[PDB]
């Protein structure tokens, strides 16, 4: 039976104890075990009735199921979602995650697995501390809890509890022989999670329990990441602890001052200037043992400035904010080394701030430096290219000139990122193949928007040649979307999703200029989709042939001139005339169609199914292939 089990699961989810008893009445032991312990797929969850009853917190339901019927403690199934789709979790894990003391107490008294390990070794203690119920954590503790059992990423309950803002649970774990020196999969400790959380009480309890501060696998000590996250309170605690020496504390002060000028949430130039006072004074208070910071060459994005080595230069910027933000970014790169992922969001946000008030000259170079850092860090950067396309379309719409070297550099980074995404999806796993393909298609679309912008702007012959070479590299690479669409097919398709922020105001697809430029760059005119539609099949189905007759006419002219079989057949044996919805496109193609005896003879050969293997040249062997 399936209906009775489904109704039992639904009643357990709803808490209908009378209905549950009615459904479970007059049932044998096998029937009792089948109705309680059957995995049902409801609401996106493959769960047993006991799992959904423990998750809902129904104490009466779970106690009836475990007392009168004695449901087994091996209720394994998929529970919850949003990064917590772990399968095989027992009812105790769900009860601890649900944050109901009565349910976990009843399950423990009934013999649930306290240290149960899931497919990702998710212990119930981790879920209990994630929910924040101290009583559940304790009740798990006295029932032979294993604090060594952690996630497969070496994430213990203490680390994830310190990540959240709950001091009571981390204090109870620390007094219950925790592991303050824990090391995660990335090398980060729970001290880093506490520092980025901004709760100084957790750090105080950790250092009271021999926290033993140390850098992570990447190389970011917790004081440094606390400084980067504008957590001044967390920074001003290790000085009281008195174990950060003098160079680490002063670079923490410098990074804190640099971060307050760039972080959007904690944007306050006053705090930046105050902590820069603190950094300068603590550097220049002794003289004999003066601590000096290194000098990096100036970066063209921030103008021409290398920190403020003389303090009087720092106090010379108390009347300005732009140079203060640039100095903060310079100091942030000097400390972080311009290699962590944390160096890109500040400069990107500064570029955005320069962009909202039409100061595009600084925004473009700031975002270009951020994009170069992202590319040199081997990080996904499709969003940065998308925002480049957006800002380029915005400044195009405002009738302001786009710098040709700027768009050339963006195109270079775009084709490099498309190569990176192509080789990433070449050997990607099934768990991430959909998102990898989505990123690849987003990179393709943003490349198309950039090419459309480059057609929109006016540049010299050298800049146009550079842009054409950058496009031709990708054209020779021959990128294909999940539907088999090449660059030409998307450039001639009206169904290409143009971004809604600013690109849709300028980049309109299909566009005659982008297709003409792609053909000049050597696009394969006779390409196919997965269903065989060439560029001509795609364009002839265009929805606005009257108002946009110029675009459709130019696309068809360019496609025919570059060489396109105007009677090529897709998998459904439909010529572009047979695929053309509008009569305007039909007659445009007929004007651009040249009668040929080779096509007529190939059509006759295909219709009569004459065997053309080795009887004709290979060129004809494919000519009848697509006719």
């Amino acid at each position: 039976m399936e209906g009775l089990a489904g109704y039992v699961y639904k009643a357990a989810s709803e808490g209908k104890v009378l209905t549950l008893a009615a459904l479970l009445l007059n049932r044998s032991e096998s029937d009792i075990r089948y109705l309680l312990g059957y995995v049902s797929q409801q609401g996106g969850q493959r769960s047993t009735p006991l799992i959904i009853a423990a998750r809902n917190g129904h104490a009466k339901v779970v106690r009836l199921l475990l007392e009168h019927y004695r449901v087994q403690t091996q209720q394994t199934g998929t529970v919850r979602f949003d990064g917590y789709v772990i399968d095989g979790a027992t009812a105790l894990w769900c009860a601890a995650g649900a944050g109901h003391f009565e349910v976990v107490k009843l399950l423990v008294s009934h013999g649930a697995n306290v240290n149960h390990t899931t497919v990702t070794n998710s212990t119930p203690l981790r879920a209990a501390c994630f929910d924040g119920r101290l009583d559940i954590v304790k009740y798990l503790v006295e029932n032979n809890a294993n604090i060594s059992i952690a996630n497969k990423y070496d994430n213990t309950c203490l680390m994830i509890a310190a990540y959240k803002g709950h001091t009571d649970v981390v204090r109870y774990l620390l007094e219950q022989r925790a592991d303050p020196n824990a090391k995660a999969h990335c090398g980060a400790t729970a001290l880093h999670f506490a520092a980025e959380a901004g709760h100084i009480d957790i750090v105080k309890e950790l250092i009271k329990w021999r926290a033993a501060i140390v850098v992570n696998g990447h190389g970011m000590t917790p004081l440094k990441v606390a400084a980067e996250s504008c957590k001044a309170d967390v920074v001003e605690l290790l000085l009281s602890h008195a174990d950060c020496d003098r160079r680490s504390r002063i670079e923490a002060l410098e990074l804190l001052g640099a971060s307050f000028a760039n972080d959007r949430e904690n944007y306050d130039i006053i705090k930046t200037y105050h902590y820069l006072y603190l950094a300068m004074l603590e550097r220049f208070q002794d003289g004999d043992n003066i601590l000096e910071k290194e000098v990096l060459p100036p970066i063209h994005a921030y103008g021409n400035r290398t920190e403020c080595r003389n303090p009087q230069e720092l106090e010379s910027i108390r009347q300005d904010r732009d140079a203060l933000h640039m100095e903060g970014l310079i100091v942030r790169e000097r400390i972080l080394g311009a290699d962590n992922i944390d160096v890109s969001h500040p400069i990107i946000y500064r570029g955005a701030v320069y962009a909202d008030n039409m100061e595009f000259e600084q925004c473009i170079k700031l975002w270009l430096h951020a994009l170069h850092l992202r590319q040199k860090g081997n990080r996904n950067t499709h969003k940065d290219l998308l925002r480049f396309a957006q800002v380029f379309s915005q400044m195009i719409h405002l009738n302001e000139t786009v710098k040709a070297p700027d768009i050339e550099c963006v195109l270079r980074c775009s084709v490099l990122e498309i190569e990176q995404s192509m080789n990433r999806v070449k050997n990607i796993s099934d768990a991430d193949v959909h998102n990898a393909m989505d990123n690849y298609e987003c990179n393709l679309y943003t490349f198309l928007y950039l090419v459309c912008i480059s057609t929109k702007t006016q540049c010299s012959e050298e800049d146009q040649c550079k842009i054409n070479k950058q496009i031709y590299n990708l054209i020779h690479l021959d990128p294909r979307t999940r539907e088999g669409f090449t660059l030409l097919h998307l450039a001639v398709n009206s169904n290409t999703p143009v971004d809604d922020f600013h690109t849709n105001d300028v980049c309109s697809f299909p566009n005659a200029l982008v297709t003409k430029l792609l053909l000049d760059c050597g696009a394969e005119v006779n390409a196919v989709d997965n269903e065989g539609n060439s560029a001509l099949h795609i364009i002839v189905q265009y929805n606005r042939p009257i108002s946009d007759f110029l675009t459709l006419h130019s696309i068809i002219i360019s496609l025919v001139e570059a060489g396109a079989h105007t009677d090529m057949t897709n998998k459904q044996n439909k010529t572009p005339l047979d695929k053309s919805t509008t009569g305007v496109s039909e007659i445009l193609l007929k004007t651009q169609m040249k009668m040929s005896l080779k096509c007529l003879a190939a059509r006759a050969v295909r219709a009569n199914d004459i065997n053309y293997q080795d009887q004709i040249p290979r060129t004809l062997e494919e000519f009848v292939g697509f006719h």
Partner: peptide, 10 residues
């Protein structure tokens, strides 16, 4: 404004 769209990855 461009500052609003940055909250996604950060």
């Amino acid at each position: 404004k461009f500052a609003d769209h940055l909250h996604k990855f950060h």
